[PDB]
């Protein structure tokens, strides 16, 4: 709703850092304990985050970077969620997997 994720990939290569792109809607006011976290799809509560980053500062079309080490190892679906200081999710991305789109043993012939 109030926070929107852009350029979210369906696939993120394991071992690469993930740049998360987000934009605040016109009437949304970000706060400094606000955060972005990566949730298994089907998360029940915001306390279930796999990994997180604080909303990036300072704030003047935003991005935050997730280091490869802290990213999910498995084949499950995840999404970005924006959680404000009150514990309220203000935006959630399309789902994605941490995995090559094409497994490496695959060779495309043209």
């Amino acid at each position: 709703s109030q926070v929107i994720f852009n350029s979210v990939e369906k696939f993120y290569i394991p071992g690469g850092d993930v740049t998360c792109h987000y934009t605040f809607t016109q009437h949304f006011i970000p706060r400094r304990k606000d955060w972005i976290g990566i949730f298994r799809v089907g998360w029940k509560t915001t306390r279930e985050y796999y990994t997180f980053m604080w909303v990036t500062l300072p704030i003047d079309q935003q991005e935050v970077q997730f280091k490869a080490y802290y990213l999910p190892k498995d084949d499950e679906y995840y999404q970005f969620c924006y959680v404000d200081e009150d514990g309220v999710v203000r935006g959630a991305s399309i789902p994605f997997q941490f995995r090559p789109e094409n497994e490496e043993d695959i060779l495309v012939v043209t």
Binding site: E101, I106, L107, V108, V109
Partner: protein, 114 residues
Amino acid sequence: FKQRKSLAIRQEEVAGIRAKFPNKIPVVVERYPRETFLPPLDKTKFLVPQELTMTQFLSIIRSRMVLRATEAFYLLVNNKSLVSMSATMAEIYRDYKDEDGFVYMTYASQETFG
């Protein structure tokens, strides 16, 4: 690789492959297990054009060898089937395709069937 993956998992892999490349034929290529001479591949699944001949496909397989071997060798569908090397992948798929949606090939420099 019927032993590593379940029928449904393989059918799913074919589904995904076909969704990204609906025009290709998915081919599982495997080194004859008793091969002592030819080197292994850096690739397992080959997504090939319908019109590609068995010969051209053999040259591709050769190009994926982790060591360089110029020697002639055999391409056996299912490891049971000697086929015309002038045959296109479309024909091999029509005639030899596995129930899971994959075509299987074994490459060997020599083999003795029972």
